Design a protein around this ligand. Structure first.
Ligand SMILES: Nc1ncnc2c1ncn2[C@@H]1O[C@H](COP(=O)(O)OP(=O)(O)OP(=O)(O)O)[C@@H](O)[C@H]1O
Ligand SMILES: Nc1ncnc2c1ncn2[C@@H]1O[C@H](COP(=O)(O)OP(=O)(O)O)[C@@H](O)[C@H]1O
Ligand SMILES: [Mg+2]
Lengths: 281, 261, 278, 169
């Protein structure tokens, strides 16, 4: 499980430039669910992301994650075992590929966490098969690849050791629709395997379709923490807090403005189609 | 740690950056001429006047001198021991505190202090873009070699713009590598040496892509070489620039008469 | 009268597959022609080839003409004055040390006297919504602000064609909307032609003409209301079906019958409302 | 000479050297600055003479952005320009070998770190040459043996990068 107590992060404590990155946060994320972290630009999503693996340590806060406890005065020793269980993929993670070989780059992850020379290789091939990258592209340089293939290699690099908690910063930003859907289904299937996925994204359609919990930030302050069918229930509330709503929800709102009833809350396209079918039934 | 300029309203802030840089260079050159107590007193008075004329708190000078105080102390004491002479106050195997040794140590400390203070005054009270413009202006005489100083100025301008960006990219790359188990300060000599590659190779790739994108962007906007281009950002003189001209010139007298010929 | 016209041509950077192959299209004057395709379809090379950065492999049968002048090694730096491109990455193209210097880079390159440069730069910076940021450093600006600076710099030299090469891909949705609205306002005011290169079809939904590319070949061209309904072609080459047509396809599979001319969601919702009468 | 794209790459490498000048690696008492790495990049990629330019400008640029608290002086600029010149002489187009790395590091630390830097510190601060050298020689005898291994691994990585689709040769 993941749990925050009163947490604050202040950039450059003291100093004339003292920006409050995070405000008083209090939430608990249940292990094994899909969580989508949403908010406008500059809301502190990246700081909250980095707080998970103790890259950024709190200021007057307590974090309980993967059995570990992080406090403002904790040291850098022992974070090697935390970063094995809680792993973060940053935005444009394809920029981190540096190794001589695709396979070597994928297995650079597990090897750092004590994997043997055979276990790391087997995990690396397994996840290279899973991410969709085909076989002959192995033993190639990571730089002699397409953008989508480079991103697949980068994601396989951080999924290769099976971390319990994975936090993804806009994983499918620039991919094709087929690749985007493939990556989203990969993360959903990883979540269905018992692990926890925390997604930081601006796409509300993905939040409606896949997320089980929605974590809404505004100016470093947690404004809402609930299921997607409750975060997107009030359009004016979303507009006030710089939050967008699903395109399916927008169409549902327009149809209801035309007067046609729609049972439930059609946040995704199959639900909208079924709602229309029931309305005209 | 990027950015050391501290805004202020005193007349030093209005001096043209070229004149301020010339004053710094000339002060460093003139420090070479100090070899007796009179000349060191003269440079001390002039440097302290230049420091007070900025209006800055002494804390900025102290912060500037902290990184080198160990070097200053070690150099001063070793010069004191190696140039010992005259009256002896404490004698050991090699350590011999002496009047001439203390005088030489004081001289070395004064040279260190005033070089550091003049450099801090130049750095703090000038915007980085203006220092860049002054440095590009002082590279003008190289045109007698027919070297394209336009390319030199363009390279300096582009490099100064991209240090803040590439630094943040380096931080991002280190964080991305650390998130998957990389250790950048542990593991002994060989592992520490190996750990620099995960930092450098993606940074070099980013530099390559930035170079290609910026070259295309510059070529598409009409760039065809430094020959035949006007300027938007210019440096222009004023009356205040007569202050450094006198301040140096007067100094040039007070040293020459007073130094031990 | 067409602004850009290209006769069939191909370019190779050295590579077996040419990036383009017999590409041939015409672009009107005062249009919002939208260029869409795959991430390896050859759109960026088209953008770079319009202003003369790249040259066709056989000049004897290839032809590129912008604003009535035919592109050639001698004519480059004359077509490049009439068309400007805003590239994908906001900060990689930011060359100046400040906003004013970045805007003034293009005028410096043309040996404009400084007294006129000051006025032109001030007016160009005021045309976009960044009048007070005339001294901000590149690192103090967001992606949308840097794209505004790029558009202002392009607008300073007064081009006749603006090519937005996936300019809004790396911005937040509100930044995307703000930049697109700013570009539309500038196009209306200065009477320009805008060629928008984009991956998602939402931007192309408002275009006056749509060009779709695949493997370096022009697969189809026409109005967005006639390109989008061919959903099978869009799915074949892997492109995002726009919202209304995708929803109409789902209603088709659900058994609901709608006219094929249905378009932007207001018409769709009113069609469902009129169907609800029975 | 260098085309526009190569000039922008030279500016990128200058910025990389300036940034690496601020990065230290080591324990609580023994720390080595990574600046030498940048110098190798200026010698391996752009040759002996252009690296010299990249050596000089990197000293100006850093002094502009991080402050030259060691005194605004042209001798340190000459040293920072002379380093990459030797690195380029030893490593520009030749295949990566152990003896080239050894020789380049030794020659750079003998001519630039020992010698020129000691001479200019002595001239600036009035102390004679032996006083300046005795106050330094510990670092210039410890650091090169680390710079050797670091340069070997950096050259391996950069040779890996150069032979790719990214680099435009
Ligand atoms: N410098 C280069 N050398 C060789 N081939 C290249 C180079 N740059 C691109 N290509 C190739 O040329 C083809 C055309 O790519 P292009 O850049 O036109 O695509 P795009 O999807 O329009 O790009 P963008 O995303 O920038 O809009 C691709 O197969 C690409 O891999
Ligand atoms: N390196 C930094 N130094 C100081 N302040 C920062 C830094 N990075 C971010 N901030 C501030 O902290 C807040 C958190 O922003 P961020 O976490 O980047 O939000 P997002 O991830 O949504 O862009 C921002 O409003 C920004 O002003
Ligand atoms: Mg983010």
């Amino acid at each position: 499980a993941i749990k925050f107590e009163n947490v604050s992060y202040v950039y450059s404590p003291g100093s004339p430039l003292e920006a409050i990155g995070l405000d008083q946060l209090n939430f608990s994320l249940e292990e094994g669910k899909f969580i989508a972290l949403v908010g406008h630009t500059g809301s502190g999503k990246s700081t909250l992301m980095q707080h998970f693996n103790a890259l950024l340590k709190p200021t007057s806060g307590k974090i309980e994650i993967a059995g570990y406890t992080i406090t403002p005065e904790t040291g850098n020793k022992g974070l090697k075992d935390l970063r094995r269980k809680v792993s973060l993929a940053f935005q444009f993670s394809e920029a981190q590929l540096f190794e001589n070989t695709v396979l070597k780059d994928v297995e650079y992850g597990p090897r750092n966490f004590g994997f043997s020379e055979d276990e790391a290789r087997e995990a690396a091939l397994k996840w290279l098969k899973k991410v969709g990258l085909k076989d002959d592209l192995i033993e190639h340089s990571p730089f002699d690849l397409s953008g989508g293939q480079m991103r697949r290699v980068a994601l396989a690099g951080v999924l290769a050791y099976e971390p319990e908690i994975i936090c993804l910063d806009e994983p499918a930003a620039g991919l094709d629709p087929m690749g985007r859907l493939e990556m989203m289904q990969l993360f959903k299937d990883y979540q269905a395997a018992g692990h926890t996925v925390i997604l930081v994204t601006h796409n509300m359609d993905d939040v409606a379709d896949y997320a089980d919990d929605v974590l809404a930030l505004e100016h470093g302050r947690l404004i809402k923490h609930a299921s997607p069918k409750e975060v997107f229930k009030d359009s004016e509330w979303l507009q006030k807090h710089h939050l967008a709503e699903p395109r399916s929800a927008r169409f549902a709102a327009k149809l209801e403005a035309a007067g046609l009833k729609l049972p439930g809350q059609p946040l995704t396209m199959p639900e909208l189609a079924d709602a229309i079918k029931q309305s005209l039934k | 740690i990027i950015g050391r300029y501290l805004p202020g309203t005193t007349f030093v802030y209005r001096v043209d950056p070229r004149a301020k840089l010339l004053t710094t260079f000339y002060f460093i050159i003139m420090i070479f001429l100090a070899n007796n107590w009179v000349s060191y007193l003269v440079i001390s008075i002039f440097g302290l006047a230049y420091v007070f004329a900025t209006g800055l708190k002494a804390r900025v000078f102290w912060d500037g001198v902290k990184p080198m105080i160990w070097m200053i102390v070690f150099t001063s004491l070793l010069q004191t021991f190696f140039m010992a002479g005259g009256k002896v106050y404490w004698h050991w195997w090699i350590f011999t505190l002496s009047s001439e040794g203390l005088i030489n140590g004081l001289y070395v400390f004064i040279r260190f202090a005033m070089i550091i203070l003049v450099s801090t005054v130049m750095t703090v009270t000038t915007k980085p873009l203006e220092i860049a413009d002054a440095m590009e202006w002082m590279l003008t005489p190289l045109k007698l070699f027919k070297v394209n100083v336009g390319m030199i100025s363009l390279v300096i301008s582009i490099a100064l713009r991209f240090v803040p960006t590439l630094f943040d990219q380096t931080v991002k790359i280190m964080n991305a590598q650390r998130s998957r188990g990389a250790d950048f300060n542990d593991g002994g000599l060989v592992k520490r040496a190996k750990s620099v590659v995960p930092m450098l190779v993606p940074l070099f790739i980013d530099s390559l892509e930035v170079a290609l994108d910026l070259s295309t962007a510059m070529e598409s906007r009409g760039y065809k070489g430094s020959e035949g281009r006007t300027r938007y950002r210019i440096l222009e003189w004023s009356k205040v620039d007569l202050i450094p001209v006198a301040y140096c010139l007067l100094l040039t007298i007070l040293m020459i008469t007073t130094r031990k010929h | 009268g067409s602004d850009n016209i290209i006769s069939f041509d191909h370019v190779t950077f050295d590579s077996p597959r040419p990036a383009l192959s017999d590409l041939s299209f015409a672009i009107e004057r005062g249009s919002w022609t939208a260029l869409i395709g795959h991430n390896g379809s050859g759109k960026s090379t088209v953008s770079k080839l319009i202003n003369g950065l790249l040259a066709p492999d056989d000049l004897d049968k290839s032809s590129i003409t912008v604003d009535g002048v035919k592109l050639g090694a001698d004519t480059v730096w004359e077509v490049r004055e009439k068309v400007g491109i805003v590239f994908q990455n906001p900060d990689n193209q930011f060359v100046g040390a400040t906003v004013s210097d970045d805007v003034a880079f293009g005028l410096e390159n043309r040996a404009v006297p400084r007294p006129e440069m000051l006025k032109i730069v001030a007016q160009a910076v005021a045309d976009v919504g960044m009048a007070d940021y005339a001294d901000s450093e590149p690192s103090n600006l967001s992606g949308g602000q840097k794209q505004r600076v790029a558009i202002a710099g392009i607008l300073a030299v007064k081009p006749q064609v603006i090519i937005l090469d996936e300019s809004t891909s790396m911005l937040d949705p509100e930044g995307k909307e703000q930049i697109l609205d700013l570009v539309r306002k500038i196009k209306e005011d200065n009477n320009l032609t805008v060629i928008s290169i984009t991956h998602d079809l939402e931007e192309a939904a408002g275009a006056d003409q749509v060009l779709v590319l695949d493997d370096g070949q022009l697969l189809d061209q026409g109005k967005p209301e006639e390109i989008f309904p061919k959903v099978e072609m869009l799915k074949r080459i892997g492109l995002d079906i726009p919202f209304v047509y995708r929803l109409k396809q789902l209603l088709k599979e659900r058994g609901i019958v709608l006219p094929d001319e249905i378009d932007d969601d207001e018409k769709l919702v009113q069609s469902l409302w009129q169907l609800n009468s029975k | 000479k260098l085309e526009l794209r190569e000039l922008v790459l030279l500016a990128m490498v200058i910025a990389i050297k300036v940034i690496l000048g601020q990065f230290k690696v080591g324990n609580a008492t023994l720390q080595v600055g990574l600046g030498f790495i940048g110098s190798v990049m200026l010698g391996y990629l752009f040759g002996p003479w252009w690296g010299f330019a990249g050596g000089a400008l990197s000293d100006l640029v850093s002094s502009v952005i991080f402050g030259n608290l060691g005194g605004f002086f042209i001798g340190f600029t000459l040293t920072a320009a002379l380093g990459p010149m030797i690195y380029g002489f030893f490593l520009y187009k030749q295949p990566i070998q152990i003896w080239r790395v050894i020789a380049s590091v030794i020659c750079v630390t003998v001519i630039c770190n020992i010698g020129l830097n000691t001479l200019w510190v002595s001239m600036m601060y009035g102390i004679n040459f032996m006083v300046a050298l005795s106050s330094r020689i510990l670092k210039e005898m410890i650091t090169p043996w680390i710079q050797m291994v670091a340069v070997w691994f950096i050259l391996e990585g950069l040779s890996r990068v150069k032979l790719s689709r990214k680099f435009w040769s």
